[PDB]
Protein backbone atom coordinates (compact mmCIF):
# COMPACT_ATOMS: atom_id res chain seq x y z
CA UNK A 1 0.00 0.00 0.00
CA UNK A 2 2.90 2.31 0.95
CA UNK A 3 4.75 0.87 -2.19
CA UNK A 4 4.67 1.86 -5.89
CA UNK A 5 6.71 -0.59 -8.07
CA UNK A 6 8.13 0.49 -11.46
CA UNK A 7 10.82 -1.20 -13.61
CA UNK A 8 13.73 0.98 -12.58
CA UNK A 9 12.41 2.70 -9.47
CA UNK A 10 10.48 1.79 -6.32
CA UNK A 11 8.70 4.58 -4.22
CA UNK A 12 7.92 3.96 -0.46
CA UNK A 13 5.33 6.40 0.96
CA UNK A 14 4.89 6.93 4.75
CA UNK A 15 2.78 9.98 5.51
CA UNK A 16 5.02 13.12 4.93
CA UNK A 17 7.83 11.07 3.41
CA UNK A 18 8.44 9.45 0.04
CA UNK A 19 11.69 7.35 -0.38
CA UNK A 20 12.67 6.44 -3.98
CA UNK A 21 15.12 3.54 -4.53
CA UNK A 22 16.80 2.08 -7.64
CA UNK A 23 19.56 -0.45 -8.56
CA UNK A 24 21.95 2.66 -8.46
CA UNK A 25 21.27 3.37 -4.72
CA UNK A 26 24.51 2.87 -2.74
CA UNK A 27 24.55 0.73 0.48
CA UNK A 28 25.20 3.94 2.52
CA UNK A 29 22.28 5.85 0.92
CA UNK A 30 20.15 2.71 1.67
CA UNK A 31 21.17 2.73 5.39
CA UNK A 32 20.11 6.38 5.72
CA UNK A 33 16.79 5.63 3.80
CA UNK A 34 16.05 2.76 6.23
CA UNK A 35 16.58 5.21 9.25
CA UNK A 36 14.49 7.92 7.64
CA UNK A 37 11.59 5.30 7.15
CA UNK A 38 12.07 3.95 10.73
CA UNK A 39 11.61 7.53 12.21
CA UNK A 40 8.31 7.88 10.29
CA UNK A 41 6.84 4.41 10.79
CA UNK A 42 8.31 3.21 14.07
CA UNK A 43 9.13 -0.08 12.28
CA UNK A 44 12.32 -2.01 13.07
CA UNK A 45 15.27 -1.14 10.81
CA UNK A 46 15.92 -4.92 10.31
CA UNK A 47 12.38 -5.49 8.90
CA UNK A 48 12.62 -2.40 6.59
CA UNK A 49 16.05 -3.50 5.25
CA UNK A 50 14.71 -6.91 4.39
CA UNK A 51 11.79 -5.34 2.48
CA UNK A 52 13.88 -2.67 0.74
CA UNK A 53 16.36 -5.38 -0.32
CA UNK A 54 13.51 -7.53 -1.83
CA UNK A 55 12.17 -4.49 -3.73
CA UNK A 56 15.48 -3.28 -5.29
CA UNK A 57 16.12 -7.00 -6.21
CA UNK A 58 13.03 -6.77 -8.49
CA UNK A 59 14.33 -3.54 -10.24
CA UNK A 60 16.41 -3.41 -13.39
CA UNK A 61 19.38 -1.29 -14.52
CA UNK A 62 19.02 1.19 -17.45
CA UNK A 63 20.17 -0.65 -20.66
CA UNK A 64 21.25 0.11 -24.26
CA UNK A 65 20.12 -3.44 -25.33
CA UNK A 66 21.45 -5.78 -22.59
CA UNK A 67 24.50 -3.52 -22.05
CA UNK A 68 24.00 -1.94 -18.61
CA UNK A 69 24.24 1.99 -18.42
CA UNK A 70 26.55 2.55 -15.28
CA UNK A 71 26.27 5.11 -12.44
CA UNK A 72 29.26 7.34 -13.60
CA UNK A 73 27.52 7.72 -17.02
CA UNK A 74 24.26 8.89 -15.35
CA UNK A 75 26.03 11.12 -12.75
CA UNK A 76 28.52 12.79 -15.18
CA UNK A 77 25.48 13.76 -17.37
CA UNK A 78 23.47 15.07 -14.40
CA UNK A 79 26.51 17.24 -13.35
CA UNK A 80 26.93 18.48 -16.93
CA UNK A 81 23.29 19.57 -17.17
CA UNK A 82 22.93 21.06 -13.62
CA UNK A 83 26.10 23.17 -13.84
CA UNK A 84 24.18 25.01 -16.68
CA UNK A 85 20.78 25.54 -14.89
CA UNK A 86 17.23 21.25 -11.72
CA UNK A 87 17.35 17.51 -12.61
CA UNK A 88 17.21 14.64 -10.09
CA UNK A 89 18.63 11.08 -10.79
CA UNK A 90 15.03 9.74 -10.26
CA UNK A 91 13.71 11.88 -13.14
CA UNK A 92 16.76 11.16 -15.37
CA UNK A 93 16.20 7.34 -14.71
CA UNK A 94 12.46 7.57 -15.42
CA UNK A 95 13.02 9.84 -18.40
CA UNK A 96 15.67 7.56 -20.02
CA UNK A 97 13.51 4.39 -19.44
CA UNK A 98 11.17 5.75 -22.23
CA UNK A 99 13.88 7.20 -24.57
CA UNK A 100 15.73 4.40 -26.45
CA UNK A 101 17.62 6.68 -28.93
CA UNK A 102 18.82 8.79 -25.89
CA UNK A 103 20.07 5.83 -23.91
CA UNK A 104 22.18 4.77 -26.98
CA UNK A 105 23.58 8.32 -27.61
CA UNK A 106 24.45 8.67 -23.83
CA UNK A 107 26.10 5.19 -23.69
CA UNK A 108 28.33 6.02 -26.72
CA UNK A 109 29.32 9.45 -25.22
CA UNK A 110 27.39 11.54 -27.80
CA UNK A 111 25.83 14.25 -25.58
CA UNK A 112 24.32 16.35 -28.40
CA UNK A 113 21.23 18.67 -28.95
CA UNK A 114 18.98 15.58 -28.86
CA UNK A 115 20.28 14.69 -25.36
CA UNK A 116 20.17 18.29 -24.08
CA UNK A 117 16.56 18.56 -25.30
CA UNK A 118 15.60 15.25 -23.48
CA UNK A 119 17.13 16.56 -20.20
CA UNK A 120 15.22 19.91 -20.50
CA UNK A 121 12.07 17.82 -21.03
CA UNK A 122 12.72 15.66 -17.91
CA UNK A 123 13.52 18.69 -15.72
CA UNK A 124 10.36 20.51 -16.90
CA UNK A 125 8.16 17.61 -15.70
CA UNK A 126 7.36 15.77 -12.37
CA UNK B 1 18.85 20.71 -0.41
CA UNK B 2 16.15 21.55 -3.26
CA UNK B 3 12.84 23.28 -1.99
CA UNK B 4 9.57 23.72 -3.91
CA UNK B 5 7.30 26.36 -2.24
CA UNK B 6 3.60 26.39 -3.02
CA UNK B 7 0.67 28.29 -1.46
CA UNK B 8 -0.36 25.46 0.94
CA UNK B 9 2.40 22.89 0.65
CA UNK B 10 6.21 22.86 0.78
CA UNK B 11 8.28 19.93 -0.68
CA UNK B 12 11.89 19.35 0.65
CA UNK B 13 14.05 17.12 -1.54
CA UNK B 14 17.26 15.45 -0.11
CA UNK B 15 18.60 12.69 -2.32
CA UNK B 16 16.23 9.60 -1.93
CA UNK B 17 13.78 11.54 0.21
CA UNK B 18 11.01 14.03 -0.44
CA UNK B 19 9.22 15.48 2.60
CA UNK B 20 5.91 17.40 2.03
CA UNK B 21 4.80 19.81 4.84
CA UNK B 22 1.78 22.17 5.32
CA UNK B 23 0.18 24.43 8.01
CA UNK B 24 -1.83 21.29 9.01
CA UNK B 25 1.27 19.13 9.85
CA UNK B 26 1.03 18.21 13.59
CA UNK B 27 3.90 18.71 16.03
CA UNK B 28 4.44 14.94 16.30
CA UNK B 29 4.47 14.45 12.41
CA UNK B 30 6.86 17.48 12.13
CA UNK B 31 9.17 15.82 14.73
CA UNK B 32 9.39 12.53 12.68
CA UNK B 33 9.91 14.56 9.42
CA UNK B 34 12.88 16.48 10.90
CA UNK B 35 14.50 13.26 12.15
CA UNK B 36 13.90 11.58 8.73
CA UNK B 37 15.64 14.69 7.00
CA UNK B 38 18.53 14.54 9.53
CA UNK B 39 19.16 10.82 8.82
CA UNK B 40 19.46 11.68 5.05
CA UNK B 41 21.51 14.86 5.22
CA UNK B 42 23.56 14.35 8.39
CA UNK B 43 22.59 17.84 9.48
CA UNK B 44 21.69 18.66 13.09
CA UNK B 45 17.94 18.14 13.83
CA UNK B 46 17.70 21.56 15.66
CA UNK B 47 19.16 23.19 12.52
CA UNK B 48 16.76 21.28 10.14
CA UNK B 49 13.87 22.18 12.54
CA UNK B 50 14.59 25.94 12.21
CA UNK B 51 14.48 25.55 8.35
CA UNK B 52 11.16 23.64 8.23
CA UNK B 53 9.66 26.08 10.68
CA UNK B 54 10.76 28.99 8.45
CA UNK B 55 9.13 27.30 5.41
CA UNK B 56 5.86 26.19 7.12
CA UNK B 57 5.59 29.95 8.24
CA UNK B 58 5.44 30.99 4.54
CA UNK B 59 2.39 28.60 3.82
CA UNK B 60 -1.31 29.47 4.15
CA UNK B 61 -4.43 27.70 5.44
CA UNK B 62 -7.23 26.53 3.08
CA UNK B 63 -9.84 29.38 3.21
CA UNK B 64 -13.53 29.98 2.24
CA UNK B 65 -15.94 32.78 3.18
CA UNK B 66 -13.62 34.74 5.45
CA UNK B 67 -12.77 31.65 7.52
CA UNK B 68 -10.09 29.05 7.80
CA UNK B 69 -10.83 25.29 7.10
CA UNK B 70 -9.39 23.47 10.23
CA UNK B 71 -7.66 20.05 10.53
CA UNK B 72 -10.70 18.11 12.07
CA UNK B 73 -12.78 19.17 9.01
CA UNK B 74 -10.07 17.88 6.59
CA UNK B 75 -9.39 14.67 8.60
CA UNK B 76 -13.08 13.72 9.19
CA UNK B 77 -13.63 14.11 5.36
CA UNK B 78 -10.50 12.04 4.54
CA UNK B 79 -11.73 9.24 6.86
CA UNK B 80 -15.19 9.40 5.29
CA UNK B 81 -13.86 9.06 1.73
CA UNK B 82 -11.13 6.44 2.44
CA UNK B 83 -13.39 4.11 4.45
CA UNK B 84 -15.26 3.72 1.07
CA UNK B 85 -12.51 4.00 -1.68
CA UNK B 86 -10.33 1.41 0.13
CA UNK B 87 -7.01 6.20 -1.45
CA UNK B 88 -6.63 9.95 -0.90
CA UNK B 89 -3.75 11.60 0.96
CA UNK B 90 -4.02 14.91 2.95
CA UNK B 91 -1.46 16.39 0.47
CA UNK B 92 -3.76 15.69 -2.52
CA UNK B 93 -6.97 16.76 -0.70
CA UNK B 94 -5.08 20.10 0.25
CA UNK B 95 -3.90 20.65 -3.31
CA UNK B 96 -7.32 19.72 -4.70
CA UNK B 97 -9.34 22.01 -2.37
CA UNK B 98 -6.96 24.98 -2.98
CA UNK B 99 -8.54 25.37 -6.45
CA UNK B 100 -12.23 24.43 -5.56
CA UNK B 101 -14.09 27.24 -3.79
CA UNK B 102 -17.64 25.74 -4.03
CA UNK B 103 -16.34 22.44 -2.61
CA UNK B 104 -14.50 24.27 0.27
CA UNK B 105 -17.86 26.04 1.04
CA UNK B 106 -19.92 22.75 0.85
CA UNK B 107 -17.33 20.97 3.15
CA UNK B 108 -17.25 23.93 5.61
CA UNK B 109 -21.10 23.91 5.91
CA UNK B 110 -21.19 20.06 6.47
CA UNK B 111 -22.79 19.33 3.10
CA UNK B 112 -20.75 16.27 1.97
CA UNK B 113 -22.83 15.50 -1.10
CA UNK B 114 -22.31 14.13 -4.71
CA UNK B 115 -20.47 17.37 -5.65
CA UNK B 116 -17.93 16.73 -2.82
CA UNK B 117 -17.61 13.02 -3.56
CA UNK B 118 -17.00 13.80 -7.24
CA UNK B 119 -14.21 16.38 -6.34
CA UNK B 120 -12.55 13.76 -4.06
CA UNK B 121 -12.75 11.06 -6.84
CA UNK B 122 -11.08 13.59 -9.15
CA UNK B 123 -8.20 14.25 -6.64
CA UNK B 124 -7.68 10.47 -5.96
CA UNK B 125 -7.62 9.66 -9.71
CA UNK B 126 -5.28 12.74 -10.07
Residue numbers in the entry:
A (entry chain A): 530 to 614, 618 to 658
B (entry chain B): 530 to 615, 618 to 657
Sentences reproduced from the published study:
The C-terminal domain (IV) is essential for down-regulating Chr2 initiation and has been shown in vitro to play a crucial role in self-interaction, promoting cooperative DNA binding and oligomerization. The C-terminal region of RctB, named domain IV (RctBIV), is critical to downregulate Chr2 copy number through its involvement, directly or indirectly, in handcuffing activities and binding to 29/39 m15,16,29. The structure of RctBIV reveals that it is organized into two structural subdomains connected by an extended linker or hinge region. The N-terminal subdomain consists of a 3-stranded β-sheet stacking two α-helices and the C-terminal subdomain has 4 α-helices in a bundle. In the crystal, RctBIV retains a dimeric association, confirmed by Size Exclusion Chromatography (SEC). This dimerization is primarily mediated by a β-sheet (β3) spanning residue 545 to 549 and involves an interface of 392.4 Å2 (primary interface). The crystal lattice contacts of the C-terminal subdomain suggest the presence of a secondary interaction interface involving 315.4 Å2, which could mediate further oligomerization via this region (secondary interface). A DALI31 search confirmed the C-terminal subdomain as a protein recognition domain capable of forming transient homodimeric interfaces, with Z-scores between 3.7 and 5.4. Thus, RctBIV can form homodimers via two different regions: at a primary interface formed between the β3 sheets and at the secondary interface between α-helices. Collectively these results suggest that RctBIV could be an anchor not only for dimerization but also for the formation of transient oligomeric structures when bound to DNA or even to bridge two chromosomal regions.
The replication of the two chromosomes in the pathogenic bacterium Vibrio cholerae is coordinated by the binding of initiator protein RctB to a checkpoint sequence, crtS. V. cholerae Chr2 originates from an iteron-type plasmid, evident from its replication origin (ori2) and initiator (RctB). RctB is divided into four structural regions (I–IV)14. Domains, I, II and III, interact with DNA via Helix-Turn-Helix (HTH) motifs and are essential for ori2 replication.
